[PDB]
Automatic annotation (TrEMBL):
Record-given protein name: RNA-directed DNA polymerase
Parent-protein residues present: 157 to 311 of 311
MF terms (GO), sorted A to Z: metal ion binding; RNA binding; RNA-directed DNA polymerase activity
Keywords, alphabetical: Antiviral defense, Magnesium, Metal-binding, Nucleotidyltransferase, RNA-directed DNA polymerase, Transferase
Organism: Escherichia coli
UniProt GO BP: defense response to virus
Family per similarity comment: Belongs to the bacterial reverse transcriptase family.
Length: 155
DNA sequence: GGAAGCGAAAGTGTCGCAACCCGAGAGAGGAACGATCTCGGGTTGCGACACTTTCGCAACCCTTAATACGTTC
């Protein structure tokens, strides 16, 4: 991990320098470059810059995956490395995963959840508390605080 | 990267069919010799197709891993 992070220090530096001037923010989760901007029609020129910079730096060894270059906007689904970005500009787990968690909690309410799926739900609710804290409060309202306390951590 | 099978893709040879040629022959006419149409091989050109070669998909996972619960690469 650290070797791969260092091998793209110059790539990250050049991309960030050339990308912040056009008002585009750039990140990389070590294999997955993310660009976003509030200015329309400026991201369409980024993949060519990425390709030419990769050729300049790594030659032919490192290259983009042209089948994995995805454009998106508020008209479509928006998720960055597993977290859905709402139309309200807030982080979320997505409607489908939040309904899945609701189904799991409802199953636990009636004692239809075995040990393995109970552990999976406690793990997923820890992750949900990390990503979307308001979901925990909403589930406390929906499924009562006592039931959530019995499932989640008690000490 | 690439077993083992197998099939795609492209190139090359081959082999049968058509088209023509060429000698032999019975004998039209009409009064003889041999016109003319056919029989039997033989040659060549051509194109469809069979055969030949190369490439590429992707087993396994090497001695050599860790094992609370969840996302991410």
């Amino acid at each position: 991990p650290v070797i791969s992070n260092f091998c793209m220090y110059e790539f990250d530096n050049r991309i960030h320098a050339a990308c912040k001037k056009v008002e585009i923010t750039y990140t990389r989760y070590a294999d997955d470059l993310t660009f976003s901007s509030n200015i329309p029609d400026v991201l369409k020129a980024v993949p060519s810059t990425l390709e030419v910079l990769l050729k300049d730096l790594f030659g032919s060894a490192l290259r983009l995956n042209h089948s994995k270059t995805v454009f998106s906007s508020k008209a479509h689904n928006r998720h960055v490395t597993g977290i859905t970005i709402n139309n309200e500009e807030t982080l979320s787990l997505g409607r489908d995963r939040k309904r899945f968690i609701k189904h799991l909690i409802n199953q636990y309410k009636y004692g239809l959840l075995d040990n393995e799926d109970k552990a999976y739900l406690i793990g997923l609710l820890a992750f949900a508390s990390h990503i979307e804290p308001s979901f925990i409060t909403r589930m406390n309202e929906k499924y009562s605080l006592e039931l959530m306390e019995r499932l989640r951590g008690q000490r």
